[PDB]
């Protein structure tokens, strides 16, 4: 029960087969110029320096890969917004990986505001900042919280309801809509319907490939703790149920407008490609 | 299908079973905020000023029917800011009229500035922006999804997709984001701003709303009702569906009890108060 390694190959193949049948369109990686990647890394370093944390270029590049693979390159209009999502993703990933004893909101929150004010217009900057603030504040609030225990152990429905915020997808949507400048996508981002539609597909993939690491650290925010992964029959029924969840979401996503559904599906499928890369 | 046009045969039994569930699981009864006649006149005058640019005349009696949900579904023991409370009264009522209006008469250029005016009158500068954005997103969502293929997909596929739509569409996310200044409670404020507050309360609010508005909505051809996902003409299929919805409400309520005391008081007063107002 400590590991999903016996299922790693089969589940990877089954994820890919599902995407090939229901999405078809493959993710494509955004290539940053050397100048853009250096500007991103310099902003990341500047933002986490007040916390006294050193992070290598290699670690920044591993954090940023999800952004490079999970946006929708054919629809990008604003590369300043794109770089902002690169930076905000990376620096909040560092914050998400830190011991809460090193969490200094007075030092970090002004750095998030500075990033938002550099890359976004005034209105978008407020929206992106509030979402980043809500995300890091949620991360802090729910470490060792009875609420997290109740939501993550009760049922898949309560667990994914928690993960809408906790996996960062509502934040992601609210900092990503300026990349596309697409009115319908902007509204779905702001109502969080965008995040609610894509939460299960992101979370189930994240959870499968981070299960071994997370259970070894005593973390409970993983839907595969809701089943007995040591019982092959129980695991296979649970995994199929999660695949069915992803498929139901994907098929509803196809009712959205063409640009919006490309963004949603590139996000779910790109996250899978980056996670397995 | 006339047999599917009504939940009237189940009206008494379902009302009794809702109440029984609340008595077992919430216990604490809702209590009604009473406004002074000055407060209520101020609320209604703001409501009239807000909808007059759209050519709507609304009697005091109709306003009072709209506002009863705020009076019954807030948490009086925890109120700290009655200016924020009056703002929730006005915003609920004026967006209720907008929700009931001919979508032809929808004039965002005239209405959105009135919403901002209400928010700027009653809230501090930061809270006014949060309440206004939530009102804006709600009325815009209402407009976007009339005759939308997205609404049809989310509302006919499964209860999960339907309640996902209703987090915004029934207005609970808006409600949480305009109500947190009433309580000035840091944890509740955060749950409102992440929308976890809305996500926890959506089913309890929607199931009750849907049951008691089913007849009117299907008579109007409206599809945003979870009881269209079952055959209400089939007593066996209806009672199994209704029991599953009751189980949803109970699971939400039992999880809500893991939140801090003040927050859970607010969440449960909202669900239970909405039921009391709806059946009155
Ligand atoms: Cl805001
Ligand atoms: Mg994980
Ligand atoms: Mg209704």
Author numbering:
A (entry chain A): 15 to 291
B (entry chain B): 12 to 291
Provide excerpts from the study.
To elucidate the dynamic interactions of TPSs with their substrates during catalysis, we investigated the bacterial diterpene synthase CotB2 as a model system. CotB2 adopts an α-helical bundle fold that is conserved among class I TPSs (PDB-ID 4OMG17). The CotB2 protein sequence exhibits a modified aspartate-rich DDXD motif12 deviating from the conventional DDXXD motif and the NSE triad NDXXSXX(R,K)(E,D) as found in bacteria and fungi, that is altered to a DTE triad in plants. Upon substrate and Mg2+ binding, TPSs undergo a discrete conformational change from an open, catalytically inactive one to a catalytically active closed conformation.
To comprehend the state of the CotB2wt•Mg2+B•GGSDP structure, we determined the structure of CotB2F107A under a Mg2+-rich condition (CotB2F107A•Mg2+B). Interestingly, a single magnesium-ion (Mg2+B) was bound to the active site, coordinated by the residues N220, S224 and E228 of the NSE motif and two water molecules. Therefore, we suggest the binding of Mg2+B to be the first step in preparing CotB2 for substrate binding. The position of the Mg2+B matches perfectly with that in the CotB2wt•Mg2+B•GGSDP structure. Moreover, the conformation of the Mg2+B coordinating amino acids are oriented in the same manner as there are two water molecules in our structure that mimic the oxygens of the diphosphate group in CotB2wt•Mg2+B•GGSDP. In the structure of CotB2F107A•Mg2+B the salt-bridge of D111 and R294 has not yet been established and the remaining C-terminus could not be resolved. This suggests, that the accurate positioning of the diphosphate moiety is required for the formation of the latter salt-bridge. The overall structure of CotB2wt•Mg2+B•GGSDP is most similar to CotB2wt and CotB2F107A•Mg2+B as indicated by a low root-mean-square deviation. Hence, the structures are likely different pre-catalytic states of CotB2. The CotB2 mutation F107A afforded cembrene A as a product.
